[PDB]
Design a protein around this ligand. Structure first.
Ligand SMILES: N[C@](CC1c2ccccc2Oc2ccccc21)(C(=O)O)[C@H]1C[C@@H]1C(=O)O
Ligand SMILES: N[C@](CC1c2ccccc2Oc2ccccc21)(C(=O)O)[C@H]1C[C@@H]1C(=O)O
Ligand SMILES: *[C@@H]1O[C@H](CO)[C@@H](O)[C@H](O)[C@H]1NC(C)=O
Ligand SMILES: *[C@@H]1O[C@H](CO)[C@@H](O)[C@H](O)[C@H]1NC(C)=O
Lengths: 765, 762
């Protein structure tokens, strides 16, 4: 095999994927020029700078022990045993390894970290972004200068929140990358006010026919216009091309895998327009540019893989021993024309400097007097180096003196680097398609909206999320898990819950959304109304007129001594007229808690008193007195069952109306309307029958006037009964029927008293 | 300074035993273990030799051996385990290791060998953290884990209904995980822990006395669950003996049946229920080990050190000649069975793999040269149900691995009992193999006596009468306190304050109302009210005939006739309110009753006013004044009753005081004031009549009227003191109210009207 074993006071391990993984007889095949060779030289370049440095380990020389992992996890374990041979108590003397600057693959790093933790060897990774490595329970001597993969999920969620993109669709890929990150996105999404619409998986081993179905199932949701892509570089390229065939137009939010790469947009720049992509914020290392270009096989003997890299890159053989390859020219060299710096070069340099800084701090504390290696450094405990010194480093980037404020190299509690991501945007400048940085995410969100076009428009995706005009909108919808397009409720129904609008109170008006749970108010009849003042004055005038008759009757009751019983008949008739007149005083009052209970008793008593007086007159010293006593007893008997009707429920049970807006009800008297009219009608039918018989008979001895008066009043009772019942039977108005009966009652009272008092009026005048 | 036992064969089985004890800082490892390392290593060698000579187990394949020494340290075990991997990458490749006696050693070896696909079968590691497959993909063990004994103890406690127990833990690794396991199992079996505490190795006798006193803080916790080491248990027993405290200890495998724990502490250890791992001695292994000497044993490199340490001699001299293992007693290690079972399980898995890969040949298979831990482990190591080798006859023991790759939990229940002669011994009284079986006839305290140490609870369940919701600070203590009769409970958590009068009919839900109260007495006290009503009815009949001949009588004719009629009606009204008061009060009866006496005082007051008018001095004016006074008296009556809303339903004393709904909700305070105002006016009118000197005229009527008024005023002034004196007994108040109005009615008939009728009649 091949390895680098440069000697020094302290030796740092190294794991790089110089050779690409292969199949068959060859375990690893082609040389990785970018991720294997350029990263390998970055570690060597940094260590050479550290050795030449006067402030970082001036008396300690840093050696190397670098092995090729061949991009295989199993093959990395076999060479990982060489790092622990020197830790166990003469062809090849083992070298003590202070730390391992290796990784570049999550599978390689995971396997290596499992072996290194058993021997307390600190490990710093430069390209491993697996979220599994953040678990300190299984990897308690592992650190990385790059942020973990799930940090991108937090970055993508903030972009959605900034643009108010709530109803989003997530697309993942099979393996270990897609599931892990897309899983961590949901908790970050649910932490904010965002719910996932569709979850999808994309496989490597499938045909473009399945890719079309991935696109098609995304179109059967018109609202979802933004698609959170957490796919891989090759997987995302086919899906975007699939959308072109299906004529789709979506806004793509993508993580690492689709950053500023120009190999995905190819041939499908139309649908990819307006996409937002993330990429690691890596700056070029200017000093590394001259180091790599000035490397030649004739003077770079430290790297044993440089001969293979030179032959593979230029397709030439240095020693053409009858081979089918051209002889490499002596003047061949690499320049900026065909040299592009690898993206994670600055992370390799930072990882090397991180270990050197930790060792330098540990050396000073253990050896303050001297600047050389001590006997206390011979044991070289890895638990103290990692937990106490490596995790507590704080220094600026050695080769980035322009932005030292935000380029500090440090490790958090879980031994992970700071998350600084760049936000790009695929846009059309006009005749050219290219990416453009439109912000950055370093512990906070910062975007340049003015330079973002085709996404400057809000492009709402909240047709489900929250249209929710403040008409007590309810967040729910059948069939859809979290669409909740706010339709399933109405402004009349108060908002009390999310899944159900939960109307509280029938026919109730909410105040803003919930507080209107109280029942709607109602208005009763208005007191002292214009339509009530008239009858009140009429009743007062009628009562005053009857009172004047009473005063005249008693004054003129002396000379006519013949009519001994006439005064008694006049007195009871006057009392009945006064009682009937006084009925209107309280009947028209709107508040009737128990007033209506006495109203029916008063109306019945007034009718009974009038009927008793009429019956006594029709029938007609000791004998008249007995008739008055019998008539008085009949009136009392007529009131015996009057209170029986109110002996069950005088205030009533309840009062309602067909209209649910006015609700013009008494709300205090709920007696039976049918029973009230039936009793009133039955109280006048017998009066008319008894008066008709008296009219037919002839009363010669001075009783003709009484007989004529009885017959005249008979028609008035029939007319009033035949008119009061029909209006209140069907209409049942709050006040219109009440005032009509009041006018009829006072008119009837005035009519009956006029006939009885007609004869005294003529005699007096 | 390392030795290795390397046998040769087609398949090599690794081994890891604690041959040497921990050395410390002075040396890597010092003294040689005589039972944990040497005996188990010899057991593995004997099992391998038996397998190699078994025609029914790998007839062609010969099993090798590569046994190393871990020196009872995890770092040394990790360093030594880097010999199997080098062979996998003249080292001989292995198919799996059979080793690991300590939990840390096994954990480190499993962590190292998992990455290289090397299955590992342990024989003594009972760590509870080795069962999860998230970190140990190729680990198996024949011994059960340490959380099985926790649920075994939980089931033991449940069987004896020992809900209230106290647990004692240990500071080390063994002493915690078992405690959380037992706590988790106890909650699923309705078992509560009273006190939880930790005991450390460095604790002195003062700490043990303190923890014993803390255990004694709960008198109701007579059962102690000990999950500790042997030394901690021995120290706790010694501390309990010194303080002379009695407990029913329940212990795990840490105590077991060891006599060193009860060494000198037999008095306080009586009645303890300890559990130990179940195993049986192997006669074949004992015979093989007894016939072992350094001269004829060259395979074992550590045998010379073991011989030197056990038999105290040396090989530089010639003293190590006569000594032999046969003469000296030999004690077989309890876990030799597990080592043999692990070796045989590995051999059976290898045989099954060889048979499955190619049944054509019995020799090592062509395709079996590459050995993979994944397939072998998952497909054959887990699925073994072979018969236990060297097993006794009357027993059914199988070697199987569950889906966590652990052994089968089989424990023996042991008790510490005193014999008739006084000897103390541990005797098995049951076993736990996926089920608890105790005879409950050999335990010394299981005999019928005054309670077999009942550790029921902090308090007895109390649900028959009292409410058991009150707790003193612990949710498990379950005690009751009775509530007062006023506080009938309607729920299991509190006593409702509905009242004792509304006793539910054996329901205790909703506080069903009791209609029984003082509403109306049909015959208890209505007899007296009937007499007053009967007297009033007779007076009304007499009044009807009194005024029939009033016109004929000149004396009655001279007096006012209109006022005479209301006088009879006023007396008739006196008994009209009598039966209303007796009747059941309601929202309408009391209001009618309230108006009954309101107009009763109006007619009598008007009678006095009209009487004074005749003395001072007409019928038209007299009837006008009385009508106005009656209207005026009734004017304030209607206004007063609407001030307070009347209703039904009154509260009274608890315990069925029978005073519920005695009177309606209308307040009677205003009624007393209304009648008092008119009483003074009536009295003043009577006094004014006596002032006039018109004695010669109408002397007979004036004297009767004055006497009647004087009696009424005297009687009225006497009712007021007795109303406030009682202030209760509504039935008595109703009774004295009926007699009060009747007395006024009785004297009303005895007024000046009575002599007028007597003269006319006579
Ligand atoms: N940083 C990576 C990220 C890697 C990855 C990146 C994009 C797409 C798929 C994908 O596969 C997974 C799966 C799980 C974890 C990490 C990854 C690493 O290996 O950790 C890798 C780029 C680094 C390098 O090889 O230089
Ligand atoms: N079986 C044991 C159990 C062991 C143990 C047993 C009793 C008291 C203390 C104690 O220390 C711990 C701590 C944690 C886990 C297991 C134990 C093992 O090592 O797993 C160990 C007896 C086996 C042997 O060393 O031969
Ligand atoms: C997102 O909505 C908030 C208010 O809900 C608003 O202030 C902000 O400007 C919006 N961002 C956009 C439209 O990009
Ligand atoms: C435990 O209680 C059960 C009833 O729940 C009883 O049958 C059993 O005998 C009790 N165990 C004893 C008393 O040891």
């Amino acid at each position: 095999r091949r390895e680098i074993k440069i000697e020094g006071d302290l030796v740092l391990g190294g794991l790089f994927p110089i050779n690409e993984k292969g199949t068959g007889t060859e375990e690893c095949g082609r040389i990785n020029e970018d991720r294997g060779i350029q990263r390998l030289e970055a570690m060597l370049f940094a260590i050479d700078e550290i050795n030449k440095d006067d402030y970082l380990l001036p008396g300690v020389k840093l050696g190397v022990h670098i092995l090729d992992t061949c991009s295989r996890d199993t093959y990395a374990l076999e060479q990982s045993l060489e790092f622990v041979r020197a830790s166990l108590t003469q062809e090849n003397i083992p070298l003590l390894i202070a730390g391992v600057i290796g990784g570049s693959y999550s599978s390689v790093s995971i396997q290596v970290a499992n072996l290194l933790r058993l021997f307390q060897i600190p490990q710093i990774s430069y390209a491993s972004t697996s979220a599994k490595l953040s678990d300190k329970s299984r990897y308690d001597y592992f650190a990385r200068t790059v942020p973990p993969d799930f940090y991108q999920a937090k970055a993508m969620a903030e972009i959605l929140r900034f643009f108010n993109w709530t109803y989003v669709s997530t697309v993942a890929s099979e393996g270990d990358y897609g599931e892990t990150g897309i899983e961590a996105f949901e908790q970050e999404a649910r932490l904010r006010n965002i719910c996932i619409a569709t979850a999808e998986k994309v496989g490597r081993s499938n045909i473009r026919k399945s890719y079309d179905s991935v696109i098609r199932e995304l179109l059967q949701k018109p609202n979802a216009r933004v698609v959170v892509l957490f796919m891989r570089s090759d997987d995302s390229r086919e899906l975007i091309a699939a959308a072109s065939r299906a004529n789709a137009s979506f806004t793509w939010v993508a993580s690492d895998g689709w950053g500023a790469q120009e190999s995905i947009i190819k041939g499908s720049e139309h649908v990819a327009y307006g996409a937002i992509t993330l990429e690691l914020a890596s700056q070029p290392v200017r000093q590394f540019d001259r180091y790599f270009q000035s490397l030649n096989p004739y003077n770079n003997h430290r790297n044993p893989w440089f001969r293979d890299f030179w032959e593979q890159k230029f397709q030439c053989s240095l020693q053409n021993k009858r081979n089918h390859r051209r002889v490499c020219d002596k003047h061949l060299a690499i320049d900026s024309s065909n040299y592009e710096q690898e993206s994670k070069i600055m992370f390799v340099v930072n990882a090397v400097y991180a270990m050197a800084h930790a060792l330098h701090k540990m050396q000073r504390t253990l050896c303050p007097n001297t600047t050389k290696l001590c006997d206390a450094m011979k044991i070289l405990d890895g638990k103290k180096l990692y937990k106490d010194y490596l995790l507590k480093i704080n220094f600026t980037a050695p080769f980035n003196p322009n932005k030292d404020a935000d380029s500090i190299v440090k490790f958090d509690t879980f031994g992970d680097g700071m998350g600084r991501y760049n936000v790009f945007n695929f846009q059309n400048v006009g005749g050219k398609y290219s990416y453009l940085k439109v912000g950055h995410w370093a512990e906070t969100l910062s975007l340049d909206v003015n330079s973002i076009h085709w996404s400057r428009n809000s492009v709402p995706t909240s047709q489900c999320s929250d249209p929710c005009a403040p008409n007590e909108m309810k967040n729910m919808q059948p069939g859809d898990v979290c669409c909740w397009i706010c339709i399933p409720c109405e402004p009349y129904e108060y908002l009390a819950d999310e899944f159900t609008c939960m109307d509280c109170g029938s026919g109730q008006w909410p105040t803003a959304d919930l507080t209107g749970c109280y029942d709607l108010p109602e208005d009763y009849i208005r007191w002292e109304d214009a339509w009530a003042i008239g009858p009140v004055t009429i009743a007062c005038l009628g009562f005053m007129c009857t009172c004047m008759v009473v005063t005249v009757f008693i004054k003129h009751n002396n000379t006519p001594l013949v009519k001994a019983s006439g005064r008694e008949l006049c007195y009871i008739l006057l009392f009945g007229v006064g009682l009937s007149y006084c009925m209107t005083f309280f009947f028209i009052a709107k508040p009737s808690p128990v007033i209506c209970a006495l109203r029916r008793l008063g109306l019945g008593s007034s009718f009974a008193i009038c009927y008793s007086a009429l019956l006594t007159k029709t029938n007609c010293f000791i004998s008249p007195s007995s008739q008055v006593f019998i008539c008085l007893g009949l009136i009392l008997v007529q009131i015996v069952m009057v209170s029986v009707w109110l002996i069950l429920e005088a205030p009533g049970t309840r009062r309602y109306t067909l209209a649910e807006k006015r609700e013009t009800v008494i709300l205090k008297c709920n007696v039976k309307d049918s029973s009230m009219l039936i009793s009133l009608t039955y109280d006048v039918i017998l009066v008319i029958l008894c008066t008709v018989y008296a009219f037919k008979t002839r009363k010669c001895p001075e009783n003709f006037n009484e007989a004529k008066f009885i017959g005249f009043t008979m028609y008035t009772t029939c007319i009033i009964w035949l008119a009061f019942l029909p209006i209140f039977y069907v209409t049942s108005s709050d006040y219109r029927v009440q005032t009509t009966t009041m006018c009829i009652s006072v008119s009837l009272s005035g009519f009956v008293v006029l006939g009885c008092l007609f004869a005294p009026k003529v005699h007096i005048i | 300074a390392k030795k290795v036992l390397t046998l040769e064969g087609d398949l090599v089985l690794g081994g890891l035993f604690p041959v040497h004890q921990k050395g410390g800082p002075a040396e890597d490892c010092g003294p040689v273990n005589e039972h944990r390392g040497i005996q188990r290593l010899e057991a593995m060698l004997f099992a391998l030799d038996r397998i190699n000579r078994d025609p029914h187990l790998l007839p062609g394949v010969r099993l090798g051996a590569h046994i190393l020494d871990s020196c009872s340290k995890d770092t040394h075990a990790l360093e030594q385990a880097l010999d199997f991997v080098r062979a996998s990458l003249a080292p001989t490749a292995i198919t799996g290791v059979i080793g690991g006696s300590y939990s840390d050693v096994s954990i480190q070896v499993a962590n190292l060998l998992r990455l290289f696909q090397i299955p590992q079968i342990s024989y003594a590691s009972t760590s509870a953290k080795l069962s999860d497959k998230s970190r140990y993909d190729y680990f198996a063990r024949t011994v059960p884990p340490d959380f099985f004994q926790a649920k075994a103890m939980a089931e033991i406690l449940r069987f004896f209904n020992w809900t209230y127990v106290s647990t004692v833990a240990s500071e080390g690794d063994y002493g915690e995980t078992g405690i959380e396991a037992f706590e988790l199992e106890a909650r699923a079996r309705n078992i509560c822990v009273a006190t939880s505490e930790k005991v450390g190795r460095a604790m002195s006798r003062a700490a043990f006395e303190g923890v014993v006193r803390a255990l004694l803080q709960k008198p109701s916790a007579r059962v102690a669950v000990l999950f500790t080491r042997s030394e901690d248990a021995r120290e706790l027993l010694a501390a309990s003996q010194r303080l002379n405290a009695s407990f029913t200890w329940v212990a795990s495998d840490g105590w077991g049946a060891l006599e060193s724990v009860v060494a000198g502490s037999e008095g306080a250890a009586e009645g303890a229920i300890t559990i130990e791992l179940a195993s049986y001695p192997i006669s074949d292994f004992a015979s093989y080990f007894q016939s072992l000497d350094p001269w004829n044993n060259s395979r074992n490199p550590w045998f010379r050190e073991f011989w030197e340490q056990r038999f105290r001699c040396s090989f530089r001299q010639r003293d190590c000649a006569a000594h032999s293992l046969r003469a000296v007693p030999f004690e077989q290690e309890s876990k030799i069975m597990f080592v043999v079972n692990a070796v045989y399980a590995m051999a059976h898995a290898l045989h099954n793999m060889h048979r499955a890969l190619c049944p054509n040949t019995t020799r090592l298979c062509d395709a079996m040269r590459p050995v993979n831990g994944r397939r072998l482990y998952k497909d054959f190591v887990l699925n073994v149900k072979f018969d236990a080798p060297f097993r006794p006859a009357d027993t059914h023991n199988e070697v199987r691995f569950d889906r966590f790759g652990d052994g089968i939990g089989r424990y023996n229940i042991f008790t510490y009992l005193r014999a008739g002669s006084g000897r103390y011994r541990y005797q098995k009284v049951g076993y736990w193999a996926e089920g608890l079986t105790l005879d409950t006839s050999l335990i010394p305290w299981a005999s019928p006596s005054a309670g077999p140490l009942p550790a029921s609870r902090c308090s007895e369940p109390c649900l028959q009468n009292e409410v058991k919701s009150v707790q003193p600070g612990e949710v498990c203590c379950w005690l009751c306190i009775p509530c007062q009769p006023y506080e009938y409970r309607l729920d299991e958590f509190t006593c409702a304050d509905c009242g004792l009068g509304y006793w539910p009919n054996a329901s205790l839900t909703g506080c069903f109302e009791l209609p029984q109260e003082y509403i109306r007495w049909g015959d208890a006290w209505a007899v007296g009210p009937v007499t007053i009503a009967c007297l009033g009815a007779l007076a009304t009949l007499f009044v009807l005939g009194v005024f029939v001949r009033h016109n004929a009588t000149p004396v009655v004719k001279a007096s006012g006739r209109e006022l005479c009629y209301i006088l009879l009606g006023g007396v008739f009204l006196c008994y009209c309110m009598t039966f209303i008061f007796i009747a059941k009060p309601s929202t309408a009866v009391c209001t009618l009753r309230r108006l009954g006496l309101g107009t009763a005082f109006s007619v009598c007051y008007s009678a006095l006013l009209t009487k004074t008018n005749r003395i001072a001095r007409s019928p038209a004016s007299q009837v006008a004044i009385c009508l106005a006074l009656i209207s005026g008296q009734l004017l304030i009556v209607v206004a007063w009753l609407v001030v307070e809303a009347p209703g039904t339903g009154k509260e009274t004393a608890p315990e069925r005081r029978e005073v519920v709904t005695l009177r309606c909700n209308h307040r009677d305070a205003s009624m007393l004031g209304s009648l008092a105002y008119n009483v003074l006016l009536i009295a003043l009118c009577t006094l004014y009549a006596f002032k006039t000197r018109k004695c010669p005229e109408n002397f007979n009527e004036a004297k009767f009227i004055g006497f009647t008024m004087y009696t009424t005023c005297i009687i009225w002034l006497a009712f007021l003191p007795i109303f406030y004196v009682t202030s209760s007994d509504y039935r008595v108040q109703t009774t004295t109210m009926c007699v009060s109005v009747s007395l006024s009615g009785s004297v009303v008939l005895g007024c000046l009207f009575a002599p007028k009728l007597h003269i006319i009649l006579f």
